[PDB]
Amino acid sequence: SPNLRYPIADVSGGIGMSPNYRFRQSMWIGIVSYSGSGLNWRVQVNSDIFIVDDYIHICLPAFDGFSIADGGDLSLNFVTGLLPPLLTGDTEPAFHNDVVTYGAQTVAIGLSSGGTPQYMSKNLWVEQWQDGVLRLRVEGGGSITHSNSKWPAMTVSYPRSFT
Amino acid sequence: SPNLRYPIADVSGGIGMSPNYRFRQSMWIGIVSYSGSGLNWRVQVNSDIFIVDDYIHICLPAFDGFSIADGGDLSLNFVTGLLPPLLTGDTEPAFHNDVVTYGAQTVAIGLSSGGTPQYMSKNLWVEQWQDGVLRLRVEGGGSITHSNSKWPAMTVSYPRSF
């Protein structure tokens, strides 16, 4: 500790890499809020969080929501829900509150009105983290008339702030 | 110090990990070229570049192109466009100019002829980096008759040469 700085730390009486830096497991139980063009709904999820090296992984499970717009946002509220000792500031990205287009992936959401769903290929990316809320952008792929949305399991990753 | 080697460096007067290794932000403005079976077009993009640990992330934003084949290539020209001090050699992968099938993802491209687009699920992966050009393979999912292609924002990441 006097001459070593995390993640460099004492490993069995030697200069090594801290096991907490290499792998860390946490959990989040909170609200996933969708905001589209005139559409708003909330869902509660229980997500696994993995912190590996300078990345953080939010492993969202499949959840079911309601109508979505062609263009919308997905918001994760980390001000509450993190399992101690993980804090809200631990989810802050390395680019802080910058607006980005990071981790852009294709997600298939099933839109339905209670019947058999029709799956649309939307575009998801990490856009911004501000005041403990991580905003994901969901747009593209078109839409149909629907009242319910079937969301797949989605893993959201981004660099983790260390300063 | 003559006893520390990057990324291990002096951190506030102590042996630590260089913050430049942990996070580095850059930018690229250049040409994305598509080559298919008899099809060729170019697009200019402004992409964010993030270098985290021994990975590099090229965050391509959404761009619009023209006709694509069932099997084709996407090429990023890093010989020019990188914001200094980032150089072309900084984009070289840890597997150098080897042919690989790395980071294979599913990307949904909207094909249209000026009307309502139809989205095809294509298969994208990093295949080769050679002489400063990163080549991505795009194939599968079938096709329709089209003149324009709507490409989504795609993040292309791979290990970085050290």
Epitope: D98, E127 | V45
Partner: antibody, heavy 121, light 108 residues
Framework: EVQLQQSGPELVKPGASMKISCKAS????????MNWVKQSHGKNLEWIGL????????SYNQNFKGKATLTVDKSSSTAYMELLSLTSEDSAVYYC??????????????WGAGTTVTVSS | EIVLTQSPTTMAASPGEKIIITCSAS???????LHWYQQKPGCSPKLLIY???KLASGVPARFSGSGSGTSYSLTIGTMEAEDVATYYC????????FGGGTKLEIKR
């Protein structure tokens, strides 16, 4: 720095056509796209069209289709806009602005000095 | 398609005040496609803020950008006399559109 030189003011009689030029200097790459913006009396900005060197064909605003013709002389690195069948409603200030650093998120980072067009008999 | 609406249309403020100009979009747009421009009297529009919150080169640090979805804002922490101008927000998510414009003037 990259600068844009627009042609001087022009007085055009109704029904005639005038062409404006925009010459780009100091650019580091050739991939930038050229735009034309109309600011009418009342300071209302309207996007007219763009020309992309790799697209090879100009894109227009539907309200300006047939009113404006966008062309490029790559040898001289000058862009031209031809306004046909001018009206009083066409009397405005026409800017040329390029997508230089804003090539993917579509912000006009470099603007021209402006070309003010008067239409009167 | 996407209509941008600015409020207020005109604004008067004394130096030292905090000025907030909001931009409302008819549809949800990614924050990467909402930008701001400043047009001082007699000059061409200049880029002020790009990608919602990134400051264009040269602008003073008293300028800030904020917003997501359909609600965006431009904020001057402390207004100075040189800030008198008309500000426009422009969207690039769909066909390019500009905002009505907010004209700022100095109370004295």
């Amino acid at each position: 720095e990259v600068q844009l030189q627009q042609s001087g003011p022009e007085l055009v009689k109704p029904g005639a056509s005038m062409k404006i030029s925009c010459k780009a200097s100091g650019y580091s790459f050739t991939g930038y796209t050229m735009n034309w913006v109309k600011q009418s009396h009342g300071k209302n900005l309207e996007w007219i069209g763009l020309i992309n060197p790799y697209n090879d064909g100009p894109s227009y605003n539907q309200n300006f289709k047939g009113k404006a013709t966008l062309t490029v002389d790559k040898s001289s690195s000058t862009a031209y806009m031809e306004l046909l069948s001018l009206t009083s409603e066409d009397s405005a200030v026409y800017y040329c602005a390029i997508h230089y650093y804003g090539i993917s998120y579509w912000y006009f980072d470099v603007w021209g000095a402006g070309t003010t067009v008067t239409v009167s008999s | 398609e996407i209509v941008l609406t600015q409020s207020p249309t005109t604004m008067a403020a004394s130096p030292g005040e905090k000025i907030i100009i909001t931009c409302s979009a008819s549809s949800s747009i990614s924050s990467n496609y909402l930008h701001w421009y400043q047009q001082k009297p007699g000059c061409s529009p200049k880029l002020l803020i790009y990608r919602t919150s990134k400051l264009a080169s040269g602008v003073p640090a008293r300028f800030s950008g904020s917003g997501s979805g359909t609600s965006y804002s431009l904020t001057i922490g402390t207004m100075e006399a040189e800030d008198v101008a008309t500000y426009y927000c422009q969207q690039g998510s769909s066909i390019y559109t500009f905002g009505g414009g907010t004209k700022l003037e100095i109370k004295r």
